[PDB]
Amino acid sequence: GPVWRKHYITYRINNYTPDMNREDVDYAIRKAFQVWSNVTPLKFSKINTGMADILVVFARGAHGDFHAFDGKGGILAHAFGPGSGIGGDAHFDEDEFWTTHSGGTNLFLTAVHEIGHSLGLGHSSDPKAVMFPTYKYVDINTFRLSADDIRGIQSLYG
Ligand SMILES: CCCCCC[C@H](CC(=O)O)C(=O)c1ccc(C#Cc2ccc(Cl)cc2)cc1
Ligand SMILES: [Ca+2]
Ligand SMILES: [Ca+2]
Ligand SMILES: [Ca+2]
Ligand SMILES: [Zn+2]
Ligand SMILES: [Zn+2]
Numbered sequence: 001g002p003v004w005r006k007h008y009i010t011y012r013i014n015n016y017t018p019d020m021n022r023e024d025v026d027y028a029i030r031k032a033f034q035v036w037s038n039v040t041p042l043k044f045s046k047i048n049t050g051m052a053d054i055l056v057v058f059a060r061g062a063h064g065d066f067h068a069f070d071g072k073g074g075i076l077a078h079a080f081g082p083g084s085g086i087g088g089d090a091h092f093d094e095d096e097f098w099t100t101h102s103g104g105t106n107l108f109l110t111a112v113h114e115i116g117h118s119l120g121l122g123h124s125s126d127p128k129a130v131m132f133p134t135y136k137y138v139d140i141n142t143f144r145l146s147a148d149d150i151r152g153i154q155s156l157y158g
Contacts, residue, residue: 003084006157009044009119010052017058017094020107024100028107029056029115031140036115039150041158044119054079054088054118056111060095071095075135076110079117090114108140121153 013029016022029046037044044054061068069075071093079090092098092114098105116131123131130145 007042009042009054010050011044011046011054012048012052012056013046014055014057017098019094020058020098021100025107028100028140029111032108032111032115035112035145036119039145039154040119041154042119051085054115055086055090056114057089057091058094059091060093063091065091065093069093072097073105076105077114079114088118090117102139105137106140109138109143112143121156124149 011033013025016025033044033046046052060071065075065078073096075093076096076098077090077092080087082088092110096105098107100107112130120131123129123133125132127134127136128146129149130143
């Protein structure tokens, strides 16, 4: 049907992963959402029934990701552009070992990046902006966002 929205976005979480703790995914995804929403004119909303805009699914390198990247570290996940259905969703290398709160890779870091890809604009290309390709494990404790960066996205279409 006729799709043309620019404020209210939908979201859906996969089966809470097989390993990754569900409560952990909700907390990490919740915090990232507030950071992306509180810095954006477009509010977001998760559900668990009807179709949604940003869909988060856990899979191992196979369906793409450049002939299946890794499954034990390296990258964490990726997301596509707009569109419908599949478009706007992301895939996290579930095969690997994810660590909630601490122990390695946090869901928050991937949640913020994955989310920004769906809504957030282009990247910065610079070892500092929460979007750049270069991966660097960093507990959310230091996950800080430049005022100019967040202010630019909110000031653009907001
Ligand atoms: C050109 C292909 C890019 C692949 C790079 C790996 C992939 C990119 C993506 O998420 O889309 C990935 O899984 C990934 C890459 C970077 C990060 C990060 C980060 C980060 C580091 C430090 C700070 Cl302060 C903030 C964020 C996460 C996942
Ligand atoms: Ca990985
Ligand atoms: Ca989608
Ligand atoms: Ca896993
Ligand atoms: Zn993928
Ligand atoms: Zn990116």
